[PDB]
Amino acid sequence: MNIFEMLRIDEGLRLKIYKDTEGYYTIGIGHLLTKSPSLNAAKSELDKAIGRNCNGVITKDEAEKLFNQDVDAAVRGILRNAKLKPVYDSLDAVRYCALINMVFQMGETGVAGFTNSLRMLQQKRWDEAAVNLAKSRWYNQTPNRAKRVITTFRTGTWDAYK
Ligand SMILES: [Cl-]
Ligand SMILES: [Cl-]
């Protein structure tokens, strides 16, 4: 297991524009296209992203291409965020995948806002962190995935993904 296999499981793979859990136009492996209620706006973002008129549909290779850019974007984000960097740097490789995951899902600023959980994570107070992480809209809106990510932070193993 690694970050890609992990997000591939949580995000799924769909080659036609669809709406995500929040109701936002998405494609491939959780590649958010836009927060706009307009499908044409989404379609424009799509063609811009791919570099061709996709008419709302892309290939598997294309989905994976956007996926790698996105994963990478999430990490670079963490690395450049004054609040996220120290945590990320303090964690072992398994646990940081849980952090990338959150960022991929809710954005840098979003996660950077989990002040209390971040500190507990940095402090390596695993069970306590896991409890604090769950007192969140995130956990309540996507409980099963949040449980996987949280279990990952708590144990530092890939159990929740097997
Ligand atoms: Cl809550
Ligand atoms: Cl879920």
PDB file of C-alpha atoms and ligand atoms in Angstrom:
ATOM      1  CA  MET A   1       0.000   0.000   0.000  1.00  0.00           C
ATOM      2  CA  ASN A   2       1.074   3.583  -0.786  1.00  0.00           C
ATOM      3  CA  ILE A   3      -0.539   7.000  -1.193  1.00  0.00           C
ATOM      4  CA  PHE A   4      -1.795   6.227  -4.711  1.00  0.00           C
ATOM      5  CA  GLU A   5      -3.392   2.928  -3.888  1.00  0.00           C
ATOM      6  CA  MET A   6      -4.855   4.551  -0.785  1.00  0.00           C
ATOM      7  CA  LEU A   7      -6.513   7.462  -2.562  1.00  0.00           C
ATOM      8  CA  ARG A   8      -7.531   5.212  -5.436  1.00  0.00           C
ATOM      9  CA  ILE A   9      -9.599   3.256  -2.901  1.00  0.00           C
ATOM     10  CA  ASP A  10     -11.103   6.258  -1.165  1.00  0.00           C
ATOM     11  CA  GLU A  11     -11.783   8.233  -4.331  1.00  0.00           C
ATOM     12  CA  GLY A  12     -12.745   5.527  -6.840  1.00  0.00           C
ATOM     13  CA  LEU A  13     -12.261   5.784 -10.629  1.00  0.00           C
ATOM     14  CA  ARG A  14     -14.925   7.200 -12.976  1.00  0.00           C
ATOM     15  CA  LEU A  15     -14.243   8.361 -16.510  1.00  0.00           C
ATOM     16  CA  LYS A  16     -17.347  10.500 -16.928  1.00  0.00           C
ATOM     17  CA  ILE A  17     -17.909  13.745 -15.108  1.00  0.00           C
ATOM     18  CA  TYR A  18     -19.873  13.022 -11.955  1.00  0.00           C
ATOM     19  CA  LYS A  19     -20.861  14.783  -8.737  1.00  0.00           C
ATOM     20  CA  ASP A  20     -18.826  14.112  -5.620  1.00  0.00           C
ATOM     21  CA  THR A  21     -20.054  13.563  -2.045  1.00  0.00           C
ATOM     22  CA  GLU A  22     -20.394  17.335  -1.744  1.00  0.00           C
ATOM     23  CA  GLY A  23     -22.271  17.529  -5.003  1.00  0.00           C
ATOM     24  CA  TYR A  24     -19.379  19.096  -7.011  1.00  0.00           C
ATOM     25  CA  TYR A  25     -18.468  18.181 -10.571  1.00  0.00           C
ATOM     26  CA  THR A  26     -15.674  15.658 -10.549  1.00  0.00           C
ATOM     27  CA  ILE A  27     -13.874  13.205 -12.840  1.00  0.00           C
ATOM     28  CA  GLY A  28     -11.333  10.348 -12.733  1.00  0.00           C
ATOM     29  CA  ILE A  29      -9.781   9.715  -9.350  1.00  0.00           C
ATOM     30  CA  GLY A  30     -11.292  12.476  -7.242  1.00  0.00           C
ATOM     31  CA  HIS A  31     -10.124  15.296  -9.514  1.00  0.00           C
ATOM     32  CA  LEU A  32     -12.443  18.116  -8.522  1.00  0.00           C
ATOM     33  CA  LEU A  33     -13.333  20.154 -11.606  1.00  0.00           C
ATOM     34  CA  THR A  34     -15.187  23.083 -10.072  1.00  0.00           C
ATOM     35  CA  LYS A  35     -17.455  24.148  -7.244  1.00  0.00           C
ATOM     36  CA  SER A  36     -19.744  25.740  -9.807  1.00  0.00           C
ATOM     37  CA  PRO A  37     -23.269  24.411 -10.260  1.00  0.00           C
ATOM     38  CA  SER A  38     -22.700  24.729 -14.007  1.00  0.00           C
ATOM     39  CA  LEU A  39     -21.885  21.581 -15.958  1.00  0.00           C
ATOM     40  CA  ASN A  40     -20.549  23.637 -18.829  1.00  0.00           C
ATOM     41  CA  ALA A  41     -18.169  25.393 -16.471  1.00  0.00           C
ATOM     42  CA  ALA A  42     -17.041  21.934 -15.391  1.00  0.00           C
ATOM     43  CA  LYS A  43     -16.624  20.840 -18.965  1.00  0.00           C
ATOM     44  CA  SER A  44     -14.491  23.871 -19.700  1.00  0.00           C
ATOM     45  CA  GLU A  45     -12.258  23.113 -16.726  1.00  0.00           C
ATOM     46  CA  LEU A  46     -12.041  19.556 -17.928  1.00  0.00           C
ATOM     47  CA  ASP A  47     -10.850  20.362 -21.450  1.00  0.00           C
ATOM     48  CA  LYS A  48      -8.469  22.935 -20.000  1.00  0.00           C
ATOM     49  CA  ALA A  49      -7.074  20.296 -17.618  1.00  0.00           C
ATOM     50  CA  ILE A  50      -6.669  17.580 -20.279  1.00  0.00           C
ATOM     51  CA  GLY A  51      -5.716  19.765 -23.186  1.00  0.00           C
ATOM     52  CA  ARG A  52      -8.481  18.686 -25.505  1.00  0.00           C
ATOM     53  CA  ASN A  53     -12.269  18.750 -25.949  1.00  0.00           C
ATOM     54  CA  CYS A  54     -13.279  15.771 -23.860  1.00  0.00           C
ATOM     55  CA  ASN A  55     -16.993  16.369 -23.952  1.00  0.00           C
ATOM     56  CA  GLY A  56     -17.102  15.322 -20.295  1.00  0.00           C
ATOM     57  CA  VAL A  57     -15.314  12.012 -20.818  1.00  0.00           C
ATOM     58  CA  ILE A  58     -11.671  10.980 -20.347  1.00  0.00           C
ATOM     59  CA  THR A  59      -9.528   7.861 -20.547  1.00  0.00           C
ATOM     60  CA  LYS A  60      -7.990   5.805 -17.722  1.00  0.00           C
ATOM     61  CA  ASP A  61      -4.496   7.066 -18.588  1.00  0.00           C
ATOM     62  CA  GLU A  62      -5.832  10.599 -18.537  1.00  0.00           C
ATOM     63  CA  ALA A  63      -7.502   9.993 -15.145  1.00  0.00           C
ATOM     64  CA  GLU A  64      -4.192   8.677 -13.686  1.00  0.00           C
ATOM     65  CA  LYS A  65      -2.312  11.671 -15.163  1.00  0.00           C
ATOM     66  CA  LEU A  66      -4.557  14.124 -13.355  1.00  0.00           C
ATOM     67  CA  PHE A  67      -4.279  11.870 -10.263  1.00  0.00           C
ATOM     68  CA  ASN A  68      -0.488  12.106 -10.112  1.00  0.00           C
ATOM     69  CA  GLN A  69      -0.586  15.898 -10.587  1.00  0.00           C
ATOM     70  CA  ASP A  70      -3.155  16.150  -7.829  1.00  0.00           C
ATOM     71  CA  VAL A  71      -1.309  13.877  -5.392  1.00  0.00           C
ATOM     72  CA  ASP A  72       1.825  15.819  -6.044  1.00  0.00           C
ATOM     73  CA  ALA A  73      -0.006  19.101  -5.632  1.00  0.00           C
ATOM     74  CA  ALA A  74      -1.281  17.971  -2.228  1.00  0.00           C
ATOM     75  CA  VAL A  75       2.240  17.142  -0.999  1.00  0.00           C
ATOM     76  CA  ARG A  76       3.814  20.299  -2.327  1.00  0.00           C
ATOM     77  CA  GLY A  77       0.970  22.050  -0.535  1.00  0.00           C
ATOM     78  CA  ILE A  78       1.754  20.414   2.723  1.00  0.00           C
ATOM     79  CA  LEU A  79       5.437  21.161   2.241  1.00  0.00           C
ATOM     80  CA  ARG A  80       4.798  24.842   1.741  1.00  0.00           C
ATOM     81  CA  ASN A  81       2.324  25.275   4.541  1.00  0.00           C
ATOM     82  CA  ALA A  82       3.862  26.629   7.726  1.00  0.00           C
ATOM     83  CA  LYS A  83       1.366  24.696   9.814  1.00  0.00           C
ATOM     84  CA  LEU A  84       1.407  21.387   7.910  1.00  0.00           C
ATOM     85  CA  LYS A  85       5.098  21.029   7.224  1.00  0.00           C
ATOM     86  CA  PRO A  86       6.224  20.393  10.816  1.00  0.00           C
ATOM     87  CA  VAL A  87       3.583  17.739  11.309  1.00  0.00           C
ATOM     88  CA  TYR A  88       4.345  15.995   8.060  1.00  0.00           C
ATOM     89  CA  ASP A  89       8.006  16.090   8.781  1.00  0.00           C
ATOM     90  CA  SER A  90       7.375  14.618  12.222  1.00  0.00           C
ATOM     91  CA  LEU A  91       5.469  11.604  10.942  1.00  0.00           C
ATOM     92  CA  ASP A  92       6.566   8.225   9.616  1.00  0.00           C
ATOM     93  CA  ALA A  93       5.693   7.384   6.037  1.00  0.00           C
ATOM     94  CA  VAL A  94       2.506   5.492   6.770  1.00  0.00           C
ATOM     95  CA  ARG A  95       0.929   8.168   8.913  1.00  0.00           C
ATOM     96  CA  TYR A  96       1.822  10.969   6.540  1.00  0.00           C
ATOM     97  CA  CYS A  97      -0.168   9.262   3.857  1.00  0.00           C
ATOM     98  CA  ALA A  98      -3.149   9.860   6.116  1.00  0.00           C
ATOM     99  CA  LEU A  99      -2.262  13.578   6.083  1.00  0.00           C
ATOM    100  CA  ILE A 100      -1.849  13.761   2.343  1.00  0.00           C
ATOM    101  CA  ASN A 101      -5.237  12.005   2.049  1.00  0.00           C
ATOM    102  CA  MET A 102      -6.980  14.635   4.150  1.00  0.00           C
ATOM    103  CA  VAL A 103      -5.372  17.431   2.152  1.00  0.00           C
ATOM    104  CA  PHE A 104      -6.259  15.807  -1.158  1.00  0.00           C
ATOM    105  CA  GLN A 105      -9.888  15.662   0.106  1.00  0.00           C
ATOM    106  CA  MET A 106     -10.449  18.965   1.830  1.00  0.00           C
ATOM    107  CA  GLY A 107      -7.627  21.203   0.778  1.00  0.00           C
ATOM    108  CA  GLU A 108      -4.527  22.554   2.483  1.00  0.00           C
ATOM    109  CA  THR A 109      -6.231  25.399   4.273  1.00  0.00           C
ATOM    110  CA  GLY A 110      -8.907  23.043   5.525  1.00  0.00           C
ATOM    111  CA  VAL A 111      -6.529  20.605   7.200  1.00  0.00           C
ATOM    112  CA  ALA A 112      -4.210  23.334   8.344  1.00  0.00           C
ATOM    113  CA  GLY A 113      -7.204  24.375  10.423  1.00  0.00           C
ATOM    114  CA  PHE A 114      -7.218  21.208  12.562  1.00  0.00           C
ATOM    115  CA  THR A 115      -4.972  22.945  15.088  1.00  0.00           C
ATOM    116  CA  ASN A 116      -5.668  20.598  17.968  1.00  0.00           C
ATOM    117  CA  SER A 117      -5.399  17.308  16.044  1.00  0.00           C
ATOM    118  CA  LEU A 118      -2.247  18.506  14.326  1.00  0.00           C
ATOM    119  CA  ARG A 119      -0.590  19.171  17.674  1.00  0.00           C
ATOM    120  CA  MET A 120      -1.640  15.762  19.077  1.00  0.00           C
ATOM    121  CA  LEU A 121      -0.266  14.151  15.949  1.00  0.00           C
ATOM    122  CA  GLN A 122       2.964  16.073  16.299  1.00  0.00           C
ATOM    123  CA  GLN A 123       3.036  15.025  19.943  1.00  0.00           C
ATOM    124  CA  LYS A 124       2.564  11.447  18.836  1.00  0.00           C
ATOM    125  CA  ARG A 125      -0.440  11.067  21.115  1.00  0.00           C
ATOM    126  CA  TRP A 126      -2.096   8.722  18.587  1.00  0.00           C
ATOM    127  CA  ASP A 127      -5.279   7.646  20.377  1.00  0.00           C
ATOM    128  CA  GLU A 128      -5.989  11.163  21.551  1.00  0.00           C
ATOM    129  CA  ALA A 129      -5.449  12.571  18.091  1.00  0.00           C
ATOM    130  CA  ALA A 130      -7.757   9.991  16.584  1.00  0.00           C
ATOM    131  CA  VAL A 131     -10.511  10.982  18.992  1.00  0.00           C
ATOM    132  CA  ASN A 132     -10.069  14.705  18.318  1.00  0.00           C
ATOM    133  CA  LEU A 133     -10.017  14.148  14.545  1.00  0.00           C
ATOM    134  CA  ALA A 134     -13.460  12.570  14.668  1.00  0.00           C
ATOM    135  CA  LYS A 135     -15.164  15.587  16.233  1.00  0.00           C
ATOM    136  CA  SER A 136     -15.482  17.160  12.817  1.00  0.00           C
ATOM    137  CA  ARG A 137     -17.864  17.804   9.943  1.00  0.00           C
ATOM    138  CA  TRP A 138     -15.439  15.660   7.875  1.00  0.00           C
ATOM    139  CA  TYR A 139     -15.967  12.579  10.021  1.00  0.00           C
ATOM    140  CA  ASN A 140     -19.713  13.122  10.132  1.00  0.00           C
ATOM    141  CA  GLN A 141     -20.049  13.652   6.368  1.00  0.00           C
ATOM    142  CA  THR A 142     -17.736  10.849   5.233  1.00  0.00           C
ATOM    143  CA  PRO A 143     -17.483   8.580   8.285  1.00  0.00           C
ATOM    144  CA  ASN A 144     -16.257   5.389   6.615  1.00  0.00           C
ATOM    145  CA  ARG A 145     -13.383   7.037   4.768  1.00  0.00           C
ATOM    146  CA  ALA A 146     -12.606   9.238   7.795  1.00  0.00           C
ATOM    147  CA  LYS A 147     -12.471   6.056   9.910  1.00  0.00           C
ATOM    148  CA  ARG A 148      -9.878   4.569   7.540  1.00  0.00           C
ATOM    149  CA  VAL A 149      -7.745   7.689   7.554  1.00  0.00           C
ATOM    150  CA  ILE A 150      -8.043   8.057  11.325  1.00  0.00           C
ATOM    151  CA  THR A 151      -7.211   4.391  11.913  1.00  0.00           C
ATOM    152  CA  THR A 152      -4.139   4.986   9.742  1.00  0.00           C
ATOM    153  CA  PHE A 153      -3.016   7.905  11.919  1.00  0.00           C
ATOM    154  CA  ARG A 154      -3.738   5.955  15.069  1.00  0.00           C
ATOM    155  CA  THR A 155      -1.873   2.765  14.301  1.00  0.00           C
ATOM    156  CA  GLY A 156       0.704   3.686  11.686  1.00  0.00           C
ATOM    157  CA  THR A 157      -0.212   0.499   9.768  1.00  0.00           C
ATOM    158  CA  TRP A 158      -2.239  -0.068   6.586  1.00  0.00           C
ATOM    159  CA  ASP A 159      -4.805  -2.248   8.273  1.00  0.00           C
ATOM    160  CA  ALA A 160      -7.768  -0.110   7.339  1.00  0.00           C
ATOM    161  CA  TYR A 161      -6.901  -0.541   3.730  1.00  0.00           C
ATOM    162  CA  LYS A 162      -6.793  -4.341   3.669  1.00  0.00           C
TER     163      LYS A 162
HETATM  164 CL    CL B   1     -18.329  17.387  16.251  1.00  0.00          CL
HETATM  165 CL    CL B   2     -17.368   7.776   3.601  1.00  0.00          CL
END
